[PDB]
Amino acid sequence: ASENIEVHMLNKGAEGAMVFEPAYIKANPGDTVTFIPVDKGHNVESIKDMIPEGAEKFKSKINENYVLTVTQPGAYLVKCTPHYAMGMIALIAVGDSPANLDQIVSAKKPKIVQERLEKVIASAK
Ligand SMILES: [Cu+2]
């Protein structure tokens, strides 16, 4: 059955400024991921060419409490639209060994995004 993972959108947290907590979400097809505007100024947006095959792009409204249903297996790198350069990202992994994760890891993106991404991958391993 579908399960839900809550994600807080924060001005600052464990990893520094402009964070999603958690920044790693392990899910399966049909689960939901709920993004909560704990602090103002944030949203969630799928990153270009960093969501799985067959998945639809998405972009929430600033300060919206946005419930995403994930169905397509693979990895999703999401950003906060204004705060991408500051590192405000999260990785959603749907199913095991997400096929596009290595591609996402190799893709052009800011150094701080790369650092935060690599950290959550290492923590999940
Ligand atoms: Cu933000």
Curated annotation (Swiss-Prot):
Residues given in the record as Cu cation binding sites: 42, 80, 83, 88
Any one of the GO CC terms: periplasmic space
Alphabetical keyword list: Copper, Electron transport, Metal-binding, Periplasm, Signal, Transport
Domain Plastocyanin-like: 7-95
Needed cofactors: Cu cation
One Gene Ontology molecular-function label: electron transfer activity
Cofactor note: Binds 1 copper ion per subunit.
Induction summary: Under anaerobic growth conditions and by nitrite.
Functional summary from the UniProt entry: This soluble electron transfer copper protein is required for the inactivation of copper-containing nitrite reductase in the presence of oxygen. Serves as a direct electron donor to the nitrite reductase.
The name this protein goes by in its record: Pseudoazurin
Shown segment, full-protein numbering: 24 to 146 of 146
